[PDB]
Swiss-Prot record, chain B:
Protein family according to the UniProt entry: Belongs to the peptidase T1B family.
Name of this chain's protein: Proteasome subunit beta type-3
Intrachain disulfide bonds: none
PTM annotation (N-acetylserine): residues: S1
UniProtKB/Swiss-Prot annotation, chain D:
CDD domains to which the protein is assigned, alphabetical: proteasome_alpha_type_2
GO BP terms in the entry: proteasome-mediated ubiquitin-dependent protein catabolic process
Pfam families: Proteasome, Proteasome_A_N
Record PTM Phosphoserine, positions in chain: S7, S14, S16
Annotated family: Belongs to the peptidase T1A family.
GO cellular component, one term: proteasome core complex
Residues the record lists as Phosphotyrosine modifications: Y6, Y24, Y76, Y121
UniProt keyword Acetylation, yes or no: yes
Oligomeric form and interacting partners: The 26S proteasome consists of a 20S proteasome core and two 19S regulatory subunits. The 20S proteasome core is a barrel-shaped complex made of 28 subunits that are arranged in four stacked rings. The two outer rings are each formed by seven alpha subunits, and the two inner rings are formed by seven beta subunits. The proteolytic activity is exerted by three beta-subunits PSMB5, PSMB6 and PSMB7.
PTM sites of type N-acetylalanine: A2
UniProt-recorded name of the protein: Proteasome subunit alpha type-2
Keywords per UniProt: Acetylation, Cytoplasm, Nucleus, Phosphoprotein, Proteasome
InterPro entries in UniProt: Ntn_hydrolases_N (IPR029055), Proteasome_alpha (IPR050115), Proteasome_alpha-type (IPR023332), Proteasome_asu_N (IPR000426), Proteasome_sua/b (IPR001353)
Curated annotation (Swiss-Prot), chain F:
Quaternary structure, from the entry: The 26S proteasome consists of a 20S proteasome core and two 19S regulatory subunits. The 20S proteasome core is a barrel-shaped complex made of 28 subunits that are arranged in four stacked rings. The two outer rings are each formed by seven alpha subunits, and the two inner rings are formed by seven beta subunits. The proteolytic activity is exerted by three beta-subunits PSMB5, PSMB6 and PSMB7.
Principal subcellular localization: cytoplasm
GO cellular component, one term: proteasome core complex
Keywords recorded for this protein, A-Z: Cytoplasm, Hydrolase, Nucleus, Protease, Proteasome, Threonine protease, Zymogen
The gene coding this protein: PSMB7
EC code(s) of this entry: 3.4.25.1
Protein name, as recorded: Proteasome subunit beta type-7
Enzyme class: hydrolase
Catalytic activity: Cleavage of peptide bonds with very broad specificity
UniProtKB/Swiss-Prot annotation, chain H:
PANTHER family named among the record's database cross-references: PROTEASOME SUBUNIT ALPHA/BETA (PTHR11599)
Domain of life: Eukaryota
Family, as annotated: Belongs to the peptidase T1A family.
Subunit structure: The 26S proteasome consists of a 20S proteasome core and two 19S regulatory subunits. The 20S proteasome core is a barrel-shaped complex made of 28 subunits that are arranged in four stacked rings. The two outer rings are each formed by seven alpha subunits, and the two inner rings are formed by seven beta subunits. The proteolytic activity is exerted by three beta-subunits PSMB5, PSMB6 and PSMB7. Interacts with NOTCH3. Interacts with ZFAND1.
Subcellular location: Cytoplasm; Nucleus
SMART domains in the cross-refs: Proteasome_A_N
Modified residues (Phosphoserine): S107, S174
Protein name from the UniProt record: Proteasome subunit alpha type-1
Originating species: Bos taurus (Bovine)
Biological classification of the source: Eukaryota, Metazoa, Chordata, Craniata, Vertebrata
Length: 202, 204, 241, 233, 245, 220, 250, 238
């Protein structure tokens, strides 16, 4: 699993691979690891599939009730706080690393990382999963401030492609989501749409 | 390991219009025999029987609790239980202890009331029922019983042929098991009568 | 006969008389007023001095429910203190759960639901107090809410609760609070409190003033002593002609 | 707020030895809409009147005849919300029976369990007895059943009976018209005639609700079939 | 068994009278009218409209907070009649029930199911003697995929039903008679016709010409199933269209 | 055990083998591994058989109650949510893994549910010890929007591969075809395996067994 | 809360429990249940108060309930409370059988149900059960037995007793006519028929208005059976023949 | 009437009669006086004896090293409240290793005593307390009521015939602030003596004195430690 969220001026760009494994067997090669928590809030799930699914369902339920009560669009910080509270209260029982990314009228695009253990930090960009280790240097050397939405999409696609090439638990297709004020735009990169890097030979 | 603590073997077979249930009689602790007339088959009706193999204490506990529930059911419903309903009741009773399981594998043989259609079934220790059409076996010598039954069973057997088949299968299966034997008791359930026989078996 | 002994019993007319009796108890208390302006909310309480032996500031009817929320109460003071504790717990729990300051409307709704929970059973008694909630934030602006013993919560521009609230409402209606600032609203509140107080009926009172707004940077606090003295002087000189 | 309830019984014996709360619940039932049940040779028909006080109501939204299982149906007389509560409890009891025994509950067992619930509400603390009588039909072992459960928790097996307003006149009419070996269609005709005996106004395919139980199971009769039966009557 | 007969505590707690009635429930029904307001709900062929009168006696009251229209979900809206605090508690309960239904079953609650749940809760209040029933009436508004617009009303007695048109409040009898007359003369009702029917029903039962700030209108349509509250401009346009003819 | 399912152009086809083993011995040669949930929803089971039976029965009962209350046809998403929440709150102690398929107002849906409480919504799924052979068949031959007969043939081929390449699978092939207009519970659908015909006869005759005591009770 | 409490478990100024006496009045308003103990068995003879031409045929018996393989009971009073008490009795019998693997003696079962009744009459604030019960059975200790229990929780053993409507007249008749140690089941049935005939004076005796159940021992087994309509008709015919013979001989 | 038997029943006048009856219970007790200077807080209690052969009832209790109370009303209620306050102070010293502020303790007392006044079957605490404490804010005199209301007082008197003591405290409040310990105790003793009839005089048997200050822990002077404070008191002015 490799997940990635990057913040640009108007919003955020989310990305994930689609491989779910039971050992070395790929049980689901078209998995959708980008979960919409609200209209403009998504989450990236890594770790135990059951734990992440249950936590995402519970946070969706709580955030929907909270937004209905307040008659106001929810904050990305509020969704991150709910995820953090649930993941910290049950840190011994859950195995869930979450990335919460979304757009706010009051705060704009926001990326929050909630790793295993239950800490919460806002970042310009976040990467998670077993395949994120292989792309730390790439995102460190490639990220720059002021990137547009298209540049953020290309950056996320490149990093995900490299991680999928190197990581055995990552692969399949690249699912991208761009969230801004107008709405959420989703796309799937597959086949030759995935960025290609030539293998060095001889 | 826990199921082999006391030994035992229960077998049920289907005839044309009859059922047969058989069990060994040995009661023992590990490799020591205590008694040779332990009851493993319990009547659950006029033409309904249950055989229990496994821990002897769990055999007795399950038989008594099943008799409790069956007596309450028959007092309330005002009728005799059907063998499928009894199988469901045993499954519920065993699954209530899913995390504290009884170490018994019940075997149910009987004729459906008002129809007299033969019914046989077996359940695991947590209550998974398995309704077959030929035979069901349970106990420490299930492989020998399976071989004997698969070799000898025939469809639409008369009660005499059914008796001979189940007797030969049980005798030759418990002759090859260390912790089973010390006699065999066979019940043949017909529409009009029930025949109980003890077989001349080895006592070693 | 006997239809007015329990909050779990309706009258033939369709009334819950225990709640009305609690509201009557509220109507016997001294008057506290609150005015919302374009940049904050100002609270003023006519705190009666029942005995000269009491310390100044004793039995204060202004509370800090949260860093940004103030509370002005009227009625039974023990019930008001319990409701202030409930509001404080609600705000603390909201910050613990959702990670940010509770909106004043949401807090008012929660406390109003808690109050309404005491108007349904014979096992409990309706609260004998009514109170106002004031707050200010950059995103939400100035907000002012009032909760009555029945559990009804409404937003207000200017609210008065207590013995003389109709005269206080008449005095407040003469104010163009939508364009005023907290500095002038403090003096206006002091003048209204001095106007509605009954010198013949009540021997003496203290003027308790508090505000929340941009001048306090979104914090609810007691109005500073200088501004309080200026407002009291202005109120006294306005009473004189 | 306090979630505790009253721990003392609201139904108590009188100096004459009568539970007057049960009698008042029976009066509430007797003030309800007429309901008729007829056990035929090959099935049971449950019939009732549902005339809304206005044409603004949606006749197709609330059903007085309700299925409990695939083979058991319900109809009531008295207070509608109480009937809803009892329908929910009866469905839950039938599903529990199926979970335990893996066979559909017999009509008698479900009637006994519902009557036990009604007795519990007649004796427990801080509650009033239900203000409904239930007409329960079912098909078990190739045989139809018709039962009536009263607010007190007592149940009776009936060939034909009536509840609600003018239920004594309906009972006399059923005594005059009922006979054994009756076919299901004749039973439906007799039930509709029993409803007509006390019906005020014009009876259409929406003013009444009919449910039938037979070997195929229990089902509500659609308004088109009710219209056909009314035209045939 | 005689009319108006009383025995024991049947006037004080929810126990049966000799006639078989529950007087506390009727008293809660009167508590509904104690509020003094009236609301009207009308169902169209592709829409559903709720209109209630908005009374703000004093200018010191922030008018944006005096609302009797609430949204339970994105697609379900309600209008409350009766006691305000009871209405708010019932609205909170309905919101919780809808959210829990979505969490547990994976799809949005139907309007009929929500009305049934609220009616069940109010019935529980009618059967137990330790608590007061709520003196409020709830009318639910929503769009069903199979059946279309839905209008459901539940009362303190535990009774609920679907309606082509319904009313609640002080003048609910006159409004129901007017809606009976309108529905009997059946003709095609578009969204505009349904809104005008509800508005004119309220105006004729209150016998007052309406201003855009004196009423409150919420609608759901098949094209836009989301529940929305009309602004003063749209209400003014509807009122002008009504007044020209 | 080999259980498989596909989504075809108009519904769901479920498949299973009918062999149940206890260790390395075949206990049942005709075992029904496709479980009724609702008239439009069925389920294939793997794992602890008693856990699967009880979980499917409980969810079927709850769905029946839900459909009785609502008066509508049950949704596959409701069954999936109920199953996954119940499995998750037991933290995998209920070792039931399920292939859930059905057709509702939204169309045909297929789910795979795991004992810890994680679900996947896929156009084709496999489960059991023979799941990899059936998955190979699917990945080799599956195409979207197949016809009913083509889907039945594909599921039968997958189950046959599981039967003939896994020691835990065998016997017959059972198919459940679900569409918005009909439901087809084909048991058995194929019989690729049969007992060999006898080459001789065994000795089993009357009087062969010696009897010590005999008691006969006449039932009136 | 205090205002609405009825105080069902408090003493009266004369030391009486009013709710218990009112439940006993309810018993007195119920149908007649009769029990006679003979040498070779014991019988129950209840009056069918549920009579109507539109009523369906009863499954086993309207008022006689089998408690276990060796006992049966008859109830007078509130029917649903009787259902609760019979379910509890069956539960107690099954619990004893589970614990000891022997059928419960009759007096122990009666004592358990009476303990439940007394617990309801002492605490809880609930109304008492308005049921009186007649118990018949056989056990290895005392053979055939007949017991009667009250809503107060008081029980006692009897040779012949009656509860329900016109129970005092039936008790007087049994006192006059019961012969201790000489009763057979046939003479007991004749006495039961004559007592039911005299007590049910408003309605002439017929097999459709009475239910009769007997308890006998048949080769080490207890047989609890309900008399068929023809058998009760023959009993009534014999009673009428004897009455006509007495009329002629007087 | 019908409104004076339950604490959960409002009256048509907006009053709860059970609370007023508990206030009467407080008014039934013997008079005690609390007063404070800039550096000390003093409680002087007029003890009462059931008989000539009975010891005078305790009226001043130890709560903590910086807090003491004087009681008036139901003695068992007073002991319950004192135990609650002692537990609260011990918890404060255990968790924060600092003395609990007096105002926060009084707030806790009010919160605890408000609950029984709103629940069916409970009754108000029929005791009124005068609390003397010293903390970072200096000396404090507090008065609690069965109505769960509490007051911050410069001086206060509760119990029977406390109106005369309150009048004397009103007269001499202007000079209470600058008095030293002996002068403050003499002022309190004169205020307490104002509650006594002419034929009765303050003696070492019926006077209890509790003092807390900046450098002085809370101490109770009962029988022979009272004589230095009694010495110097002039005769009753009549």
């Amino acid at each position: 699993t490799t997940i990635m969220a990057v913040q640009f001026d108007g919003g955020v760009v989310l990305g994930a691979d689609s491989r779910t494994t039971t050992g070395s067997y790929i049980a689901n090669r078209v998995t959708d690891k980008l979960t919409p928590i609200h209209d403009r809030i998504f989450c990236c799930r890594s770790g135990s599939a059951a734990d992440t699914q249950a936590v995402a369902d519970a946070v969706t339920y709580q955030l929907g009730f909270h937004s209905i009560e307040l008659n106001e669009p929810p904050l990305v910080h509020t969704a991150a706080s709910l995820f953090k509270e649930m993941c910290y209260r049950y840190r011994e029982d859950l195995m869930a690393g979450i990335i919460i990314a979304g757009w706010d009228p009051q705060e704009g695009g926001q990326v929050y990382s909630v790793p295993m253990g239950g800490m919460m930090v806002r970042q310009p960009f976040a990467i998670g999963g077993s395949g994120s280790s292989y792309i730390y240097g790439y995102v460190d050397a490639t990220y720059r401030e002021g990137m547009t939405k298209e540049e953020c999409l290309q950056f996320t696609a490149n990093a995900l492609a490299l991680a999928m090439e190197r990581d055995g638990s990552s692969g399949g297709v690249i699912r991208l989501a761009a969230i801004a004020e107008p709405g959420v735009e989703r796309q799937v990169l597959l086949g030759d749409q995935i960025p290609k890097f030539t293998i060095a030979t001889l | 390991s826990i199921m082999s603590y006391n030994g035992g073997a229960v077998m049920a077979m289907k005839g044309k219009n009859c059922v047969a249930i058989a069990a060994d009689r040995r009661f023992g602790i590990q490799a020591q025999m205590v008694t040779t007339d332990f009851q493993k088959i319990f009547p659950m009706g006029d033409r309904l029987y249950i055989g229990l193999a496994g821990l002897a204490t769990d055999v007795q506990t399950v038989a008594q609790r099943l008799k409790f529930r069956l007596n309450l059911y028959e007092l309330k419903e005002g009728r005799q239980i059907k063998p499928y309903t009894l199988m469901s009741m045993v499954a519920n009773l065993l699954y209530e202890k899913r995390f504290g399981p009884y170490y018994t594998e019940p075997v149910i043989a009987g004729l459906d009331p008002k129809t007299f259609k033969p019914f046989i079934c077996s359940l695991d220790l947590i209550g998974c029922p398995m309704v077959t059409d030929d035979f069901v076996v349970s106990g420490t010598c299930t492989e020998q019983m399976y071989g004997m039954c698969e070799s000898l069973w025939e469809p639409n057997m008369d009660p005499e042929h059914l008796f001979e088949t189940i007797s030969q299968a049980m005798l030759n299966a418990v002759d090859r098991d260390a912790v089973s034997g010390m006699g065999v008791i066979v019940h043949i359930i017909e529409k009009d009568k029930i025949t109980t026989r003890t077989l001349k078996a080895r006592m070693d | 006969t006997g239809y007015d002994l329990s909050a779990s019993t309706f009258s033939p007319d369709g009334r819950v008389f225990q709640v009305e009796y609690a509201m009557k108890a509220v109507e016997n208390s001294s008057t506290a007023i609150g005015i919302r302006c374009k940049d904050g909310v100002v609270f003023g309480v006519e705190k009666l001095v029942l005995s000269k032996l009491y310390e100044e500031g004793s039995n204060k009817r202004l509370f800090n429910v949260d860093r940004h929320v103030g509370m002005a109460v009227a009625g039974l003071l023990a019930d008001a203190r319990s409701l202030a504790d409930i509001a404080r717990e609600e705000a603390s729990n909201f910050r613990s759960n959702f990670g940010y300051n509770i909106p004043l409307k949401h807090l008012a709704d929660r406390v109003a639901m808690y109050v309404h929970a005491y108007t349904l059973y014979s096992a409990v008694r309706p609260f004998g107090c009514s109170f106002m909630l004031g707050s200010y934030s950059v995103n939400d602006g100035a907000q002012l809410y009032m909760i009555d013993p029945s559990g009804v919560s409404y937003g207000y521009w200017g609210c008065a609760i207590g013995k003389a609230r109709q005269a206080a409402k008449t005095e407040i209606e003469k104010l163009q609070m939508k364009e005023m600032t907290c500095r002038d609203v403090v003096k206006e509140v002091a003048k209204i409190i001095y106007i509605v107080h009954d010198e013949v009926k009540d021997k003496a009172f203290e003027l308790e003033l508090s505000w929340v707004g941009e001048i306090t940077n979104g914090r609810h606090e007691i109005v500073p002593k200088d501004v309080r003295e200026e407002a009291e002087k202005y109120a006294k000189e306005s009473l004189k002609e | 707020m306090a979630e505790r309830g009253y721990s003392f019984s609201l139904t108590t014996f009188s100096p004459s030895g009568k539970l007057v709360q049960i009698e008042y619940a029976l009066a509430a039932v007797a003030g309800g809409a007429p309901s008729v049940g007829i056990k035929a040779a090959n099935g049971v028909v449950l019939a009732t009147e549902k005339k809304q006080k206005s044409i603004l109501y949606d006749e197709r939204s609330v059903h007085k005849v309700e299925p409990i299982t695939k083979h058991i149906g319900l109809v009531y007389s008295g207070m509608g919300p109480d009937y809803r509560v009892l329908v929910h409890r009866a469905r839950k009891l039938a599903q529990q029976y199926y979970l335990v025994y893996q066979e559909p509950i017999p009509t008698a067992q479900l009637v006994q369990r519902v009557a036990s619930v009604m007795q519990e509400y007649t004796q427990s603390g801080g509650v009033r007895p239900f203000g409904v009588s239930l007409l329960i039909c079912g098909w078990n072992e190739g045989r139809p059943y018709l039962f009536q459960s009263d607010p007190s928790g007592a149940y009776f097996a009936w060939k034909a009976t009536a509840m609600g307003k003018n239920y004594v006149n309906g009972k006399t009419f059923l005594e005059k018209r009922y006979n054994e070996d009756l076919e299901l269609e004749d039973a439906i005709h007799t039930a509709i005639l029993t409803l007509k005996e006390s019906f005020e106004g014009q009876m259409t395919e929406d003013n009444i609700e009919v449910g039938i139980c037979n070997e195929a199971g229990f089902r509500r009769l659609t308004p088109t079939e009710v219209k056909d039966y009314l035209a045939a009557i | 068994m005689s009319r108006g007969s009383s025995a024991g505590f049947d006037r004080h707690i929810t126990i049966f009278s000799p006639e078989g009635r529950l007087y506390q429930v009727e008293y809660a029904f009167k508590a509904i009218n104690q509020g003094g307001l009236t609301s009207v709900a009308v169902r169209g062929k592709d829409c559903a409209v709720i209109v209630t009168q908005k009374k703000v006696p004093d200018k010191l009251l922030d008018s944006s907070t005096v609302t009797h229209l609430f949204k339970i979900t994105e697609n379900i809206g309600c209008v409350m009649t009766g006691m305000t605090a009871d209405s708010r508690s019932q609205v909170q309960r309905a919101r919780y029930e809808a959210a829990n239904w979505k969490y547990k079953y994976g799809y949005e609650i139907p309007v009929d199911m929500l009305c049934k749940r609220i009616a069940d809760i109010s019935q529980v209040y009618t059967q137990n003697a330790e608590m007061r029933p709520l003196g409020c009436c709830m009318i639910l508004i929503g769009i069903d995929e199979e059946q279309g617009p839905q209008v459901y009303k539940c009362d303190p007695a535990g009774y609920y039903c679907g309606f082509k048109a319904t009313a609640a409040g002080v003048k609910q009898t006159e409004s129901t008679s007017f809606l009976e007359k309108k529905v009997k003369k059946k003709f095609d009702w578009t969204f505009e016709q349904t809104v005008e029917t509800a508005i004119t029903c309220l105006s004729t039962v209150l016998s007052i010409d309406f201003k855009p700030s004196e009423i409150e209108v919420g609608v759901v349509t098949v094209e836009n199933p989301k529940f929305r509250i009309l602004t003063e401009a749209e209400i003014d346009a509807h009122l002008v269209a009504l007044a020209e003819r | 055990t080999t259980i498989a399912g596909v989504v075809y152009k108009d519904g769901i086809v479920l498949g299973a083998d009918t062999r149940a083993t206890e260790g390395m011995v075949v206990a049942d040669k005709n075992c029904s591994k496709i479980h009724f949930i609702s008239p439009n929803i069925y389920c294939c089971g793997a794992g602890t058989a008693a856990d699967t039976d009880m979980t499917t029965q409980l969810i079927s009962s709850n769905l029946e109650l839900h459909s009785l209350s609502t008066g509508r046809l049950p949704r596959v998403v409701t069954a999936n949510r109920m199953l996954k929440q119940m499995l998750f709150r037991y933290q995998g102690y209920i070792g039931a893994a399920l292939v859930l398929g059905g057709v509702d107002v939204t169309g045909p849906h297929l789910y795979s549910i795991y004992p810890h409480g994680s679900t996947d919504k896929l156009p084709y799924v496999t489960m059991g010890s023979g799941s990899l052979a059936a998955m190979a068949v699917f990945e080799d031959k599956f195409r979207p929007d197949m016809e009913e007969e083509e889907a039945k043939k594909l599921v039968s081929e997958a189950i046959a591969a599981g039967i003939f390449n896994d020691l835990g699978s065998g016997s017959n092939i059972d198919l459940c075809v679900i569409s918005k207009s009909k439901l087809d519970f084909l048991r058995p659908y194929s019989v690729p395996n049969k007992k060999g015909t006898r080459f001789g006869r065994y000795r089993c005759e009357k009087g062969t067994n010696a009897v010590l005591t005999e008691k006969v009770t006449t039932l009136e | 809360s205090r205002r609405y409490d009825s105080r069902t478990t408090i003493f009266s100024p004369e030391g009486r429990l009013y709710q218990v006496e009112y439940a006993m009045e309810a018993i007195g308003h119920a149908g007649t249940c009769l029990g006679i103990l003979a040498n070779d068995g014991v019988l129950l003879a209840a009056e069918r108060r549920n009579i109507h031409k539109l009523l369906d045929e009863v499954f086993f018996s309207e008022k006689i309930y089998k408690l276990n393989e060796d006992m049966a009971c008859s109830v007078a009073g509130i029917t649903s409370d009787a259902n609760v008490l019979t379910n509890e009795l069956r539960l107690i019998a099954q619990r004893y059988l589970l614990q000891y693997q022997e059928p419960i003696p009759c007096e122990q079962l009666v004592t358990a149900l009476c303990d439940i009744k007394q617990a309801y009459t002492q605490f809880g604030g609930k109304r008492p059960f308005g049921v009186s019960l007649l118990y018949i059975g056989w056990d290895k200790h005392y053979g055939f037995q007949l017991y009667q229990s009250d809503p107060s929780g008081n029980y006692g053993g009897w040779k012949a007793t009656c509860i329900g409507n016109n129970s005092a007249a039936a008790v007087s008749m049994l006192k006059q006519d019961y012969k201790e140690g000489e009763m057979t089941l046939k003479s007991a049935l004749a006495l039961a028929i004559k007592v039911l005939n005299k007590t049910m004076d408003v309605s002439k005796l017929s097999a459709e208005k009475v239910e009769i159940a007997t308890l006998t021992r048949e080769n080490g087994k207890t047989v609890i059976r309900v008399l068929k309509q023809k058998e009760v008709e023959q009993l009534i015919k014999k009673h009428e023949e004897e009455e006509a013979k007495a009329e002629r001989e007087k | 009437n019908q409104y004076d038997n339950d604490v959960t029943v409002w009256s048509p006048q907006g009053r709860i009669h059970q609370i007023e009856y508990a206030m009467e219970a407080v008014k039934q007790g013997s008079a005690t006086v609390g007063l404070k200077s800039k550096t000390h807080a003093v409680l002087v209690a007029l003890k009462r004896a059931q008989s000539e052969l009975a010891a005078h009832q305790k009226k001043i209790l130890h709560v903590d090293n910086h807090i003491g109370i004087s009681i008036a009303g139901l003695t068992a209620d007073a002991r319950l409240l004192c135990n609650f306050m002692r537990q609260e102070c011990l918890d404060s010293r255990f968790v924060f290793d600092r003395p609990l502020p007096v105002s926060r303790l009084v707030s806790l007392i009010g919160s605890k005593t408000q609950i029984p006044t709103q629940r069916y079957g409970r009754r108000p605490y029929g005791v009124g307390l005068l609390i003397a404490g010293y903390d970072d804010m200096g000396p404090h005199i507090f008065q609690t009521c069965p109505s769960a209301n509490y007051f911050d007082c410069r001086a206060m008197s509760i119990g029977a015939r406390s109106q005369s003591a309150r009048t004397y405290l009103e007269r001499h409040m202007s000079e209470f602030m600058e008095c030293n310990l002996n002068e403050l105790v003499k002022h309190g003793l004169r205020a307490l003596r104002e509650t006594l009839p002419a034929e009765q005089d303050l003696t070492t048997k019926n006077v209890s004195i509790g003092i807390v200050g900046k450098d002085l822990e809370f101490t109770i002077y009962d029988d022979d430690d009272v004589s230095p404070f009694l010495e110097g008191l002039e005769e009753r002015p009549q």
